[PDB]
Assembly symmetry: D2
Homo-oligomer: 115 residues x 4
Amino acid sequence: GDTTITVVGNLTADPELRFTPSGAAVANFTVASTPRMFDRQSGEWKDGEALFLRCNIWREAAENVAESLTRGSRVIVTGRLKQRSFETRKRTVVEVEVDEIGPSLRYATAKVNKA
Amino acid sequence: GDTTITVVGNLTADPELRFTPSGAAVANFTVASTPRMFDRWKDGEALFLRCNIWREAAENVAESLTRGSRVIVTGRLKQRSFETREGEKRTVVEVEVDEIGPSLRYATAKVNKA
Amino acid sequence: GDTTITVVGNLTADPELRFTPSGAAVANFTVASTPRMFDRWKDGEALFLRCNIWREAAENVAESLTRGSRVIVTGRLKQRSFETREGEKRTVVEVEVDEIGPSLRYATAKVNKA
Amino acid sequence: GDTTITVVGNLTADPELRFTPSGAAVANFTVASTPRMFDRQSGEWKDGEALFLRCNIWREAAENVAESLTRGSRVIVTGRLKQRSFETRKRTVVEVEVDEIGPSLRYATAKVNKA
């Protein structure tokens, strides 16, 4: 029993594809979820918190991401919340191990190809 | 305090775009979600959820997706209690979609930016 | 790849503890979840989910909760397509519970550690 | 549209109740979600990642938490993911603004009182 979450947002930049020594592909990126707060006084719905989530995806699904998504795409993401330890000069970070992901058809249309 | 859910699965039938005489557009599609563990091992159970999305998105949906497409759907769980004048006691569930996209798990897609 | 949901709401009726002749214990309860925004404004819509939990938890549930209790439920969305030999075409949904607890939003509780 | 999540875990310590200058109560705590990985070789299900989430809850619901929960209780939590900026000597942190919360009846029974 892991802690999963769905994140809707935009990619801060282009997907970053590298390779492990053994050859498996990995893509990393952050998504930016911006909520809209109502403001029951002056103006209608405004822009809320930031929320920058670093997700990393693997092997052949990561290959697909690198080929389909770019800077500032609106995506839907579902994944597991992981926690990593980085060294000072020492605390934690929170990332999203991606299970599924795809371009949101809210403001865009897509041309899909199955493998 | 609405109950929301995320659902991954494949569409069971091409989307059904329709227009309200008020000029608004609507898409209806149902998602079939099916677990699948492996070895000694495969398949297991299923879930069919009637879904609907409104406005622009609905048009993009009907243009981008087809039967069998693996989509990720997020939305709200709506429920109605129909009939009683027949004796019975029926109930149905649907999902008012917020966001939806094709999955890039087994596919690649060219996202025509629009 | 199971579809899970979180649900907040009140129990509609005291839990129904039962024992299987195999010595296992089972709890059945349905949650009613109802949105409620305010001013000019109150109430709106509803959701009834048949729930079931097994084993130890089931015993604790039947001892801790009653009708009207506000619980937080997390679990799995199970669905069955019953009947057809009647002409019709019925479908029902239930929730196989993983975790459940009373909500401390409008209540306090003394958690007898056990 | 915020990013919400459900966290099941245990409180690392006792709830910490303070008060804003105006009088509103606030409770803070971290929950510890430990997943169990199967290990299809030697041993059955093991203990997985850590996952420490700092949740903070407000006014009169926080009062209720401070009165009902203690060190190492198993709780269910549902909330929004917030991101805060702390000063170096400068990056971000991720916390959970709690909506609802309660003791899980998995291994414990509870005696509830309505207000």
